[PDB]
Write a protein that binds this ligand. Sequence first.
Ligand SMILES: *[C@@H]1O[C@H](CO)[C@@H](O[C@@H]2O[C@H](CO)[C@@H](O)[C@H](O)[C@H]2NC(C)=O)[C@H](O)[C@H]1NC(C)=O
Ligand SMILES: *[C@@H]1O[C@H](CO)[C@@H](O[C@@H]2O[C@H](CO)[C@@H](O)[C@H](O)[C@H]2NC(C)=O)[C@H](O)[C@H]1NC(C)=O
Ligand SMILES: [Cu+2]
Ligand SMILES: [Cu+2]
Ligand SMILES: [Cu+2]
Ligand SMILES: [Cu+2]
Ligand code: NA
Length: 499
Amino acid sequence: AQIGPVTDLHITNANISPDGFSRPAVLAGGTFPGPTIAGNTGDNFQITVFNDLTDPSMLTDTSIHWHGLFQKGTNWADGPAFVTQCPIITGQSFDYNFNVPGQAGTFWYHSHLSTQYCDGLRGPFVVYDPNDPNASLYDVDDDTTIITLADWYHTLAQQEPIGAAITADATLINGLGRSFTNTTASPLSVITVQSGKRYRMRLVSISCDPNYLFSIDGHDMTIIEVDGVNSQQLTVDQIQIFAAQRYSFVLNANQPVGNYWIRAQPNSGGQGFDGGINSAILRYEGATVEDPTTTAPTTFSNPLVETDLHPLADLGVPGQPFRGGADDPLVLNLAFANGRFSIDGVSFVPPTVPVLLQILSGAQNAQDLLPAGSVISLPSNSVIEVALPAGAAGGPHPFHLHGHNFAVVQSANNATPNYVNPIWRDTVSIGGTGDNVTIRFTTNNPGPWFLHCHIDWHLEAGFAIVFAEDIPDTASANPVPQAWSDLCPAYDQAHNIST
Ligand SMILES: *[C@@H]1O[C@H](CO)[C@@H](O[C@@H]2O[C@H](CO)[C@@H](O)[C@H](O)[C@H]2NC(C)=O)[C@H](O)[C@H]1NC(C)=O
Ligand SMILES: *[C@@H]1O[C@H](CO)[C@@H](O[C@@H]2O[C@H](CO)[C@@H](O)[C@H](O)[C@H]2NC(C)=O)[C@H](O)[C@H]1NC(C)=O
Ligand SMILES: [Cu+2]
Ligand SMILES: [Cu+2]
Ligand SMILES: [Cu+2]
Ligand SMILES: [Cu+2]
Ligand code: NA
């Protein structure tokens, strides 16, 4: 069952074996992935998170981010540790009480403390639209049509060297899959469809690192949503999905009744499908209960290309139709050396006092904010452009901005900008050497918003900055509850920190 929009959520440690190998984990709702949190557009969500963690090897503190939800007027509920809150300590709970006006689509939730989400705290978050403009394109849209793609590690995250190229041990599709080494024939996930019906498949990358080449043998996929943003229909036979991205696609169950492989090939770790790695099963009602015998093509003739996507609504692009044509045009210098990433020459290391609390206590320019050089102020009611030129090691880097979605004016692997009708989204691959992926948005949401690579190992190694949007209005726009004000005193007392 789905839970929400008002629900408790317990965070616990438990052993799990999603690929046949047992290890301890950090779980929401006792499962991997966690339960789907759901509601309708405009609803009040009140997710009371109970931190019941006791195993220090995966951290006993926690904090949860609601990925892609704008949090307008509720910056304190966004979740990134040391940006918008101190962590919740064990044996305590915290009500994330916010609203989702003007958003409907496919999201997710995850730990936003250190690399803790890798250890298991990740699940889907769906905001349905009772008047969805795409409703007539499918028959079925429910918990059975959500498809999660996850990387899974045998080594615990806090034992991964910082700045290292860290590689997974299994791909999990809906929580199940087979290990790349010592492969055992452990259970594969089954997605069941009825011949003749059309399904809204909600494809969610809950990855900590790899991107996946996703396809379904014999089937094609009609994209209708990108990171929460409704799209024009685009039919493809393969989707390359980067960490934290989401797509909805229509699956027409129009092939002969049978079993078909679902494939998710990561860019690192095990290559291919030997032993049923990187695989799940699409089963038609009435098919024999057996593994598929289908083949992938050698090459995919209609892969997703990001410039082919366009919004369903007339969203346009803010600003003027040329590079630098914005009120506040930025170019970030994105680099890596010696195990650490930097942005504009500064490697991100989380501050002792969360950025939001520094601002509520009176610090009101970005040079007064800690970490020094890691906070850039943005002016209010202004068009912002951010160029993100690639080349830093460990690519392709999927950059994500909190508090906002953005027009993708220039995409990976294509030097031509689009100032007319690009897709809007919240997480974007910045591509390869020489690319100049560029995003635009308007600043109508006061508060400190994290900008970072969503490969969690890279974030841990410093690949982040904070946009302090409209510092002067942050306090009036974001009144804080007493329970939020209590978090830093409790955390600092528990950890013997003076501040
Ligand atoms: C990416 O595009 C940005 C503009 O959005 C380029 O920025 C210019 O960089 C040069 C130096 O390289 C400066 O003289 C300008 O002030 C910058 N802003 C402009 C022209 O609007 C940046 O060079 C591009 N990077 C790559 C790798 O192509
Ligand atoms: C490279 O990106 C550009 C810009 O998004 C794409 O150019 C558009 O192509 C569409 C489809 O033919 C035309 O309707 C638009 O007028 C083009 N816009 C511009 C500004 O040129 C281009 O198709 C992409 N290249 C590839 C190989 O997909
Ligand atoms: Cu996220
Ligand atoms: Cu986010
Ligand atoms: Cu990265
Ligand atoms: Cu983040
Ligand atoms: Na415009």
